[PDB]
Design a protein around this ligand. Sequence first.
Ligand SMILES: Cc1cn([C@H]2C[C@H](O)[C@@H](COP(=O)(O)OP(=O)(O)NP(=O)(O)O)O2)c(=O)[nH]c1=O
Ligand code: NA
Length: 342
Amino acid sequence: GSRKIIHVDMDCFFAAVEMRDNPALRDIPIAIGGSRERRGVISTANYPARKFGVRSAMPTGMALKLCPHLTLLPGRFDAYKEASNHIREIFSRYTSRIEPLSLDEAYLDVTDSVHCHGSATLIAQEIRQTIFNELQLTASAGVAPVKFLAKIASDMNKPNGQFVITPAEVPAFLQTLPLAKIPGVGKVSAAKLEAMGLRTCGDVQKCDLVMLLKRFGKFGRILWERSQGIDERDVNSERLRKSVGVERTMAEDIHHWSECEAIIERLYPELERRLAKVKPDLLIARQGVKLKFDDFQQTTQEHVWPRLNKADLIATARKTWDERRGGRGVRLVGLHVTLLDP
DNA sequence: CTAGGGTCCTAGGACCC
DNA sequence: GGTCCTAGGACCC
Ligand SMILES: Cc1cn([C@H]2C[C@H](O)[C@@H](COP(=O)(O)OP(=O)(O)NP(=O)(O)O)O2)c(=O)[nH]c1=O
Ligand code: NA
């Protein structure tokens, strides 16, 4: 009853694409991210930049202090999506059991594969080698009996490498595995787990499920399961997008409704264009807006609405502006749509 | 000195029986 | 007791 799961994961995806398409960027620190004047953050960075401490989600101002010579690139999302479509077509050569998680990564369920003598290790190697050919980007991979171990595994031999976890190896791997390494355990959850003396899966194994359920809800059942290598989530190839959003951080805050309305006027065609690619008649389940204020508090307001409509987004943003603002400056404006259920 | 694309979970009151 | 509506938050890429 044991499954073979591969998690395939592109190395420094956006940056690797920019380096292939401009070899001059190979050995200098580079990053995709908005400028400091735009109040941007790092999307990702190459290994020369990471050597200085540059990380995804880091404010560009902090990145540049760590790495004064950092080259900042705007990002070319159609180039990234083209690489994505190609690696996914490569995955299909081995199995239809493909669950994309993002542009640059996917789960593959190769249990019923008879490629490469049924070896998931060699299938993962072949996909990585085929990706390096054909695209001149490198990938890493993880091979495990369940999703989350495969995903942790793909990080352990990166870049351009892989790691395999057999069922016989699962207990020793789990024993000292930090909880923070479990997908879905973030900074807040790890800090809370740490505050009750839980750091590793070995720690959680010695815990009562009932306590975890009280203390954490359904997440605590996930914690109890993962700490034991239990992860029955199937590789699902039939997931569909449920929302589409378009939002903008300004280079400095706005304090007048006229400015907000102007922002909306430029955002709305972008929202309409992306919605129409997937829903030509613009028919939707809800639409709404987002403001992010001075104190970084965020409010959304969204309602049932049959079809993308600019004026109603303006009107509801005006309400949000007047009501839930309380005189602060505004750093971000966003528009949002919730897609119909089929 | 804090993006923009998203997913999933929670929870109170409305609404229904 | 269910289920829908809405707002917010943690989290991932
Ligand atoms: C974590 C992260 C990623 N991205 C974009 C840019 C990344 O290149 C792309 C894939 O995300 P990964 O977490 O896999 O990071 P990576 O750049 O590919 N480096 P890796 O080699 O460690 O996987 O997704 C962002 O825009 N913001 C992010 O916070
Ligand atoms: Na990656």
